Amino acid sequence: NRPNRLIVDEAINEDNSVVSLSQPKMDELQLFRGDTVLLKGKKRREAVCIVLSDDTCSDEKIRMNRVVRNNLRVRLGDVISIQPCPDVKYGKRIHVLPIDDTVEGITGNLFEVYLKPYFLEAYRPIRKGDIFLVRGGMRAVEFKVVETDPSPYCIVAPDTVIHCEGEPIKREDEEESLNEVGYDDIGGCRKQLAQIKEMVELPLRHPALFKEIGVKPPRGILLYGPPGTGKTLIARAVANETGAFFFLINGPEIMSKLAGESESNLRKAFEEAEKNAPAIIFIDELDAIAPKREKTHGEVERRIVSQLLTLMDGLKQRAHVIVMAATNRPNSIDPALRRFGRFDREVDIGIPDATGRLEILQIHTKNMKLADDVDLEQVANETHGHVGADLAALCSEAALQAIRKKMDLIDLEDETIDAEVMNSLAVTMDDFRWALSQSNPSALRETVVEVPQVTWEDIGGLEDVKRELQELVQYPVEHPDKFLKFGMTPSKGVLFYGPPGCGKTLLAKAIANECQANFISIKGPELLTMWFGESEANVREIFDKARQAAPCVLFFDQLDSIAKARGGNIGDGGGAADRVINQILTEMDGMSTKKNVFIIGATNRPDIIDPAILRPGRLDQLIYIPLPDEKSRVAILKANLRKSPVAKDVDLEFLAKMTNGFSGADLTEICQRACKLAIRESIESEIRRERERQPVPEIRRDHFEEAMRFARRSVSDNDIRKYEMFAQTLQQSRGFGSFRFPS
Amino acid sequence: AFEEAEKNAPAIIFIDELDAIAPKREKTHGEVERRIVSQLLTLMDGLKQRAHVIVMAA
Ligand SMILES: Nc1ncnc2c1ncn2[C@@H]1O[C@H](COP(=O)(O)OP(=O)(O)OP(=O)(O)O)[C@@H](O)[C@H]1O
Ligand SMILES: Nc1ncnc2c1ncn2[C@@H]1O[C@H](COP(=O)(O)OP(=O)(O)O)[C@@H](O)[C@H]1O
Numbered sequence: 168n169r170p171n172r173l174i175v176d177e178a179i180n181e182d183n184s185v186v187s188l189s190q191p192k193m194d195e196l197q198l199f200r201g202d203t204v205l206l207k208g209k210k211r212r213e214a215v216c217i218v219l220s221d222d223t224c225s226d227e228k229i230r231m232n233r234v235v236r237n238n239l240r241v242r243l244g245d246v247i248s249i250q251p252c253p254d255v256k257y258g259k260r261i262h263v264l265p266i267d268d269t270v271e272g273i274t275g276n277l278f279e280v281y282l283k284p285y286f287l288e289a290y291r292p293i294r295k296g297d298i299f300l301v302r303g304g305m306r307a308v309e310f311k312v313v314e315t316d317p318s319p320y321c322i323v324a325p326d327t328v329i330h331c332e333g334e335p336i337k338r339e340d341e342e343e344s345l346n347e348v349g350y351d352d353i354g355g356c357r358k359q360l361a362q363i364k365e366m367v368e369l370p371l372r373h374p375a376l377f378k379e380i381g382v383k384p385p386r387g388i389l390l391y392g393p394p395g396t397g398k399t400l401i402a403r404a405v406a407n408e409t410g411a412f413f414f415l416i417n418g419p420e421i422m423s424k425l426a427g428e429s430e431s432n433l434r435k436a437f438e439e440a441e442k443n444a445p446a447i448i449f450i451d452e453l454d455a456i457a458p459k460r461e462k463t464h465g466e467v468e469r470r471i472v473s474q475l476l477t478l479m480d481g482l483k484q485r486a487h488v489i490v491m492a493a494t495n496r497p498n499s500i501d502p503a504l505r506r507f508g509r510f511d512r513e514v515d516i517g518i519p520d521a522t523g524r525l526e527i528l529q530i531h532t533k534n535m536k537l538a539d540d541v542d543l544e545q546v547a548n549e550t551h552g553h554v555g556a557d558l559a560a561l562c563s564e565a566a567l568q569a570i571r572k573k574m575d576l577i578d579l580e581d582e583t584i585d586a587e588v589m590n591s592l593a594v595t596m597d598d599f600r601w602a603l604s605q606s607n608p609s610a611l612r613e614t615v616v617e618v619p620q621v622t623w624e625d626i627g628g629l630e631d632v633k634r635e636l637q638e639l640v641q642y643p644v645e646h647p648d649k650f651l652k653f654g655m656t657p658s659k660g661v662l663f664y665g666p667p668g669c670g671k672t673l674l675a676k677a678i679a680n681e682c683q684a685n686f687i688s689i690k691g692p693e694l695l696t697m698w699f700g701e702s703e704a705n706v707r708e709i710f711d712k713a714r715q716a717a718p719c720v721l722f723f724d725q726l727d728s729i730a731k732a733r734g735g736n737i738g739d740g741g742g743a744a745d746r747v748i749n750q751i752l753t754e755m756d757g758m759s760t761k762k763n764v765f766i767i768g769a770t771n772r773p774d775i776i777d778p779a780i781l782r783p784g785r786l787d788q789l790i791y792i793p794l795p796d797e798k799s800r801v802a803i804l805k806a807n808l809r810k811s812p813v814a815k816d817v818d819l820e821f822l823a824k825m826t827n828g829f830s831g832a833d834l835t836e837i838c839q840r841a842c843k844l845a846i847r848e849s850i851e852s853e854i855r856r857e858r859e860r861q862p863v864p865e866i867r868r869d870h871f872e873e874a875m876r877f878a879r880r881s882v883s884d885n886d887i888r889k890y891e892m893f894a895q896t897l898q899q900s901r902g903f904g905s906f907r908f909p910s
Numbered sequence: 911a912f913e914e915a916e917k918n919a920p921a922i923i924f925i926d927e928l929d930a931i932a933p934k935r936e937k938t939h940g941e942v943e944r945r946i947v948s949q950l951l952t953l954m955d956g957l958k959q960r961a962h963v964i965v966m967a968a
């Protein structure tokens with residue numbers, strides 16, 4: 168749309184001094200060949216060059232060297248701008264400093280070998296901070312034009328006095344100037360990034376717009392989210408893009424009990440930041456430093472909140488200073504600090520999803536060498552709840568474990584490690600999976616459990632139940648477009664009920680692995696407390712954790728304990744049980760937007776559960792897990808004995824046929840008993856072999872016969888009759904039968 | 911100390927009784943201890959992995 172817009176492209180033969188541009192864009196820009204122009208770059212870096220006409224250069228692209236990419240901090244395909252340099256004059260004196268690593272090892276004078284031929288009749292425009300690489304000698308040498316006169320744009324001419332000697336340059340400073348953090352190093356928060364960009368970059372870029380509309384940019388930025396999510400990273404990145412001085416503030420370090428030290432600390436910090444008027448203040452852990460003045464007993468904290476209020480009131484002063492605060496919990500901050508003019512705008516930064524965490528992995532591993540085998544999509548999929556900081560830790564641990572794997576490859580005896588053997592060591596996908604297993608998501612460290620180690624193949628039978636659970640967890644998250652098209656929200660509730668040992672907990676643990684969604688398991692009575700209002704507090708905090716980790720599967724094993732018919736027990740904590748039930752009712756279906764939180768309940772006694780718990784909208788689908796039938800019993804036996812080495816002569820079909828009333832637990836008991844009999848036989852055989860010195864490949868059929876002689880039915884007939892009665896009550900509640908539409 | 915370590919190539923620093931001079935800033939008797947902890951954090955972030963100096967603490 169504009170002639171200035173340009174796409175970065177490589178230069179075949181153009182040096183770092185000049186660039187080649189397409190002739191149609193030359194005429195569109197109304198610029199002559201050899202005109203001194205300026206190119207903009209990221210992090211506010213500019214490169215002055217001589218423009219030229221090239222046929223190979225594309226219309227929408229600018230051909231430019233790699234060192235010019237370093238100078239402008241740009242990469243291939245990026246967007247840059249070109250502007251005519253006005254009132255260009257020849258340089259009278261330029262102070263140019265080679266890098267400190269380049270000077271070492273060069274016997275000859277750097278100016279004569281490199282600077283003099285390059286700058287003899289140069290006519291090459293340069294700007295302060297520009298760096299160019301000169302080929303020649305035993306090693307090519309990099310030169311930085313630190314000073315130019317006239318500043319900041321001048322033309323190099325033979326009359327200009329050029330001397331390499333001077334104050335030594337610093338490699339670390341240039342490396343930092345190259346390795347600064349920008350918006351590109353942030354991923355997965357593009358809507359929050361767009362908000363913050365419109366907040367900060369814009370008023371600096373177009374202040375006349377705000378002046379013409381007569382509004383001032385917001386002087387307060389609050390960032391709230393779980394820790395490690397990048398609240399510090401955005402603040403650090405903004406200062407580089409919009410040239411400023413990042414001034415970090417730690418909440419704990421400012422806080423002091425010296426009776427008035429903390430207020431002086433904040434006031435000094437604000438004064439120091441205002442001194443460097445293009446400044447950004449970052450107040451990390453604002454929640455600790457700023458509680459409610461009335462709520463907190465501590466007078467130091469109420470005074471520090473009041474001082475922060477006073478500083479925020481006078482913060483603007485029509486100055487470039489802006490303040491960004493990070494808090495994990497936003498409600499703990501004093502409501503006065505929530506007002507307009509002080510942190511008036513609050514931005515929520517959430518746990519990254521699959522795409523955002525993939526972007527984080529990409530940007531962290533851009534420097535790391537990546538094999539063709541490794542796919543970071545899979546690494547993002549497996550990290551169901553990892554945070555960006557956790558992702559960075561995972562990336563580092565991966566390479567460290569790769570080094571550990573290649574310890575045996577490196578003999579490390581040589582004084583210098585051989586480069587050819589160096590080449591062999593590289594990262595692998597097994598490395599990523601192992602480091603990922605070792606790495607732990609910090610989002611739900613509180614709810615951490617050992618590996619379920621159960622898959623859908625581990626469960627025999629229940630094919631329809633398996634399909635329904637997979638659809639439940641998968642359709643809303645993988646296909647939200649279809650739910651938007653058909654206009655209705657997904658159902659997010661299932662209650663498993665049935666006799667003990669039939670696979671309800673097994674189904675939940677199978678969900679845990681094969682859903683690619685976070686899983687929180689709540690043992691039934693675990694959430695209750697002896698204190699007056701803390702059981703429902705635990706309920707609402709577990710639901711809050713579920714909402715944060717969406718899509719999450721919230722599983723209540725033995726739900727009949729936490730959920731009862733209200734008023735059933737008068738002495739159950741003086742109505743604390745009923746209050747817990749009411750809290751769960753409000754948390755499942757209340758006046759809050761529904762998240763991707765799927766609540767699964769397992770119970771042996773469904774008739775005692777509160778009817779309000781079981782209505783559609785809370786545990787929508789009531790699924791009965793009955794005693795397996797003969798085919799399902801064959802499936803259970805096959806699932807249990809798939810891992811075991813079992814003889815072919817054994818007939819699992821006959822076992823399933825005879826075990827009429829056996830549950831899955833009973834059949835697993837049969838398999839375990841047969842294996843124990845085999846263990847006894849094999850160990851006794853080994854003892855006999857040892858005795859005769861001084862075997863059994865697969866479990867035989869007679870072992871299973873003895874195990875059956877030790878088999879038993881666990882679930883009584885009265886209990887299963889009760890479960891059938893509950894199911895029949897549901898069916899009678901439906902009414903009628905075989906709903907058929909007329910014509 | 912850190913300046914001398916980054917000066918020589920390579921270098922190793924050892925810090926015995928790190929907990930003695932680097933306690934929690936949340937629970938600290940003197941503000942000077944908070945200052946030394948913060949300065950230790952700043953100089954810890956000061957190295958850019960290129961000085962190749964490993965700091966050890968007991
Ligand atoms: N259909 C099945 N397929 C495979 N194993 C099963 C099946 N049903 C039960 N089991 C076995 O039962 C054991 C545990 O059962 P599980 O925890 O799923 O029972 P449950 O139905 O939730 O009962 P409870 O009400 O007593 O908690 C495991 O060893 C599991 O392998
Ligand atoms: N969205 C993100 N993209 C890339 N890196 C991230 C992101 N979020 C966090 N990090 C990593 O976290 C580290 C900074 O911690 P940070 O997340 O800022 O903590 P806090 O959440 O307390 O501000 C950086 O090293 C950075 O690599």
Ligand SMILES: [Mg+2]
Pocket residue numbers: 671672724725769
């Ligand atoms: Mg169970």
